[PDB]
From Swiss-Prot, chain A:
Sample GO molecular function, one term: structural constituent of ribosome
Record protein name field: Large ribosomal subunit protein bL34
NCBIfam families (alphabetical): rpmH_bact
UniProt cross-references to Gene3D superfamilies, sorted A to Z: 1.10.287.3980
HAMAP family, per the entry: Ribosomal_bL34 (MF_00391)
Gene responsible for this protein: rpmH
GO biological process, one term: translation
Length: 46, 102, 93, 77, 63
RNA sequence: UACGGUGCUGAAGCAACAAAUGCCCUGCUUCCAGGAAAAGCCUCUAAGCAUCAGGUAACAUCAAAUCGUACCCCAAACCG
RNA sequence: GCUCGCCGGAAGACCAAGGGUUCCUGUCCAACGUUAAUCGGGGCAGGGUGAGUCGACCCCUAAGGCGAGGCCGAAAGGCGUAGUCGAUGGGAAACAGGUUAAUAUUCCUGUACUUGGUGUUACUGCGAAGGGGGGACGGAGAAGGCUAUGUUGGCCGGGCG
RNA sequence: AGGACCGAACCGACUAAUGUUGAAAAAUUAGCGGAUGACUUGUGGCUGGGGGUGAAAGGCCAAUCAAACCGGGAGAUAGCU
RNA sequence: UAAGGUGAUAUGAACCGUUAUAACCGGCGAUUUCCGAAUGGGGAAACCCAGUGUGUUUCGACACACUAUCAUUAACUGAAUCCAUAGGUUAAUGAGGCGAACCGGGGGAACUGAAACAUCUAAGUACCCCGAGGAAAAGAAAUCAACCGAGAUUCCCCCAGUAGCGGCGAGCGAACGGGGAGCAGCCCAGAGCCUGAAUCAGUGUGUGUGUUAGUGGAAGCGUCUGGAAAGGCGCGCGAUACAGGGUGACAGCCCCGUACACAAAAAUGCACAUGCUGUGAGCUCGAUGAGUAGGGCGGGACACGUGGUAUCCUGUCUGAAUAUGGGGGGACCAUCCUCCAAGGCUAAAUACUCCUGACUGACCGAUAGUGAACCAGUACCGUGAGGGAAAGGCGAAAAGAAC
């Protein structure tokens, strides 16, 4: 049937993307925590 | 800095046949030196296009460690160690036990 | 003073050199591998200068890279841009 | 914000102690009112957020001195 | 020091740069992708020579 | 002919009837629940400029760059 | 290759999303494929995606988002004017035939069309976050005129079963 | 004209049988209701956790809901096993 | 510095080079696409689209620089409204952002314990936010002390689980005083004699010492077993080196090094007789920090829960004396003693480790030690924040098995 993930790249970059994280102070802290752990993918928008 | 250089008559201290004396052909960076007729390896070479086309079992020189060989003095028939002493950048190598520039 | 001839390093490989390229040559066009940021005007000017041919139009496309690498370690080849250079009048080749 | 602009008074946090000494956090807020003050030297009315203690120090020290203190602090009018 | 480049210290190196890049690196690139033998070292030599000319231009703005 | 596919030639190529949920139709009639905005476009002026600029028409020429383009096309390539 | 069966308002064909090389050619069959595999959407190389007209970009907005100043808030921050973004909506222009193993409104052949710049000639009052027009709009129902398209006949080539 | 009637697409889910280590972490096959409207669907957007939203069922808020998920307090505490 | 190099998996090809010029190391410069504080505007990061100024007798057009915002300052302008003011433009300077911990401030839980729970505790902890510096904070007595005196802050050890606080339960818990580390005090509330007078900053090529390249560096041979001696045996040698690693087994004398001695074009960091500039010594007299101290109300901090409760802070309302003075000595009064708030700066002792270098380990040795010895915050899961693995070893040398 219809499942929880129905993909859309525009919604994905608008919600979980780099500039969505960069607009907020809290999402900037999110990007800082990912950078501190060492992840190759800081954001899944790429 | 290099006690054993590219063209030097060297005598084997340890390993395989010690008494054999050979000339250096090549000095590799892993601390290993290639001397003519010292370590003989019989390598089975596969027939392949371009280089090594006939194949066959080939006798070639294997690398010997540079610490297992010593330079041979012509004046005294023995292995004698290497030092450097000269005031400028091109330090000359000297045979110890004879104090003569190699 | 000569114009921006240093910018005309855009042309990279003399041919892609395949069957589509050779049949397209038998019609009118040379197929070339050109930069990544090269524009059609620069490909026109570069071909007209580096070779003596006076050219008609340039059609361009980007060939995306193929993965072409195994399961344990995965890689991607580089993207490259291909120019079909139309040469109906005065073609040396 | 609720800053006195003359005496630097901010909302300070404390407790609402009960008869059973139960403690719930509360904010003491200043007596802040917008007041229009006449400056005779500059011939104008300056609109200042000011506490009651601020009005008291304005009549004590003059409006010019409080304004000069604000210029020295760097606060705008 | 390793390499002495007193030869490149001269005025108007633009023509030498155009010689080193234009037709030289270009025909080396064309012959390299078609297939030729010595270009493996010639391309590296031409690239380092262009680097020498451009470094000397950035040193001497007047030339 | 390895069956792919090439070179050449190529007859007739009309009429009547029935036809949509498609076009006329952003129409017409009727109803009440009363049916986006801004630009492109047309037109008129303000500042300004007056043999200028600008506009219109014709002709001629030049330019239209960059990115996608294969494939899956309600599914063995999407979500499961 | 010859029969048989199935779908045929699809189990046929095409756009969008989404995937990303799964498309084409050659070679291989260890692993994957619920079997074997010579086969494959599998491995490995090499090809292939050609645009002024098709989308994007772009010009303009909607819901909405951000929002210099500004108002407010203990700090973070909340809201909001000018404005600036945001298609799912409104702005220029291409169709038939052929082509490759793989691309086609792109390549070729034929016939077009649009929007700017410049030059020439001729004529002339032109000119803006300004005004107006315009874009510019609902539901249902009913003809009528057609067309896509089909049948039948005429014509043409073949058959004489 | 009709929150009109019969009925496909479409939306839903009334009964039965099969499945229940399934073909499927709610489906299949026969029947069933609505089907010009309080209808349906695509694309964006807005509402955020003792809060939202609810033609109201403790329903829904990513197979999670009488207070989601993720990290921290945290090695909470556990007279219990 | 060098006889060898073009990083590794990863060989091959094509070459470069003989120490006097190939690689390698170090100092200094050049270039440094795009995104990212992103800074010309926008954006769904790594893309879309501009403006201004400089360069087609090449009528395709290209290259370069600048243009974000905020604060301070100056200029030029400039409304309602006359003078003004708000605003607008230009120029300069600074700020953005990141970072593991330490430090200061603004807020601030609950599980839990009390064998329930509400005062209390957990705790000003976890967390969020702001700010700063290599440290930060504090700091020069309106302090303690007791008729003796000590003499700024900060950290350690006692006092001492003491005195007290407390549903006087749970539990919280000092100070006086003594021993140590380290030990500078100053300046403005203002005038006359002095304007690098001694400091303090900026600022130097001077001198010394370090750091970032390096150089030299001693002394072993016979014989046995073995595939191989570093081991066994015999006879020696160096030792300011017998730290360590490697070499075909266990090497002081085989190789890197090691004790020891030396070296730095250049760039820097410290210290100083020091090279320049500006503030600023000291004398004399005058001042002695008011919406402040204090009080009322409500709260917070002091070990101190409002109690008998001194001290400190202020949200609200009030409100002095002004050196004849005022504060403190734990309700309060008298006496006595001590000290001058309502203005600031101040080094060391103290805290921490993202990073560098050496050394050390009764630390681990591939289910261990970091999650990660290994191409690991990767594969893989999830919309996302986030979670998150397994996986070392041929041999001395590939001699990696021709036929």
């Amino acid at each position: 049937m219809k499942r929880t993930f129905q993909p859309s790249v525009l919604k994905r970059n608008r919600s979980h993307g780099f500039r969505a994280r960069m607009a907020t102070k809290n999402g900037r802290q999110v990007l800082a925590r990912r950078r501190a752990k060492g992840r190759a993918r800081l954001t899944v928008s790429k | 800095a290099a006690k054993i250089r590219r063209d030097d008559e060297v005598i084997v201290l340890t390993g395989k046949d010690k008494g054999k004396r050979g000339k250096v052909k090549n000095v590799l960076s892993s601390g290993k030196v290639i001397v003519e007729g010292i370590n003989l390896v019989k390598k089975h070479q596969k027939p392949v296009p371009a280089l090594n086309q006939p194949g066959g079992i080939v006798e070639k020189e294997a690398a010997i460690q540079v610490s297992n060989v010593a330079i041979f003095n012509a004046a005294t028939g023995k292995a004698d160690r290497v030092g450097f002493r000269f005031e400028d950048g091109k330090k000359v190598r000297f045979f110890k036990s004879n104090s003569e520039t190699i | 003073m000569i114009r921006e001839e240093r910018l005309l390093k855009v042309l990279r490989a003399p041919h892609v050199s395949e069957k589509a390229s050779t049949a397209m040559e038998k019609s009118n066009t040379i197929v070339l591998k050109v930069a990544k940021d090269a524009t059609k005007a620069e490909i026109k000017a570069a071909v007209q200068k580096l070779f003596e041919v006076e050219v008609e139009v340039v059609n361009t496309l980007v060939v995306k890279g193929k993965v072409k690498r195994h399961g344990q370690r995965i890689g991607r080849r580089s993207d490259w841009k291909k120019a079909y250079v139309t040469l109906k009048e005065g073609q040396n080749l | 914000s609720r800053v006195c602009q003359v005496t630097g008074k901010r909302p300070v946090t404390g407790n609402n102690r009960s008869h059973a000494l139960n403690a719930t956090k509360r904010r003491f807020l200043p007596n802040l009112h917008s007041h229009r003050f006449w400056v005779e030297s500059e011939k104008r009315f300056v609109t200042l957020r000011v506490s009651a203690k601020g009005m008291r120090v304005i009549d004590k020290k003059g409006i010019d001195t409080v304004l000069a203190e604000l210029r020295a602090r760097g606060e705008k009018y | 020091m390793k390499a002495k480049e007193l030869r490149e210290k001269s005025v108007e190196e633009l023509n030498t740069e155009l010689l080193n890049l234009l037709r030289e690196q270009f025909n080396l690139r064309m012959q390299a992708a078609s297939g030729q033998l010595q270009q493996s070292h010639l391309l590296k030599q031409v690239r380092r020579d262009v680097a020498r000319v451009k470094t000397l231009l950035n040193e001497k703005a007047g030339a």
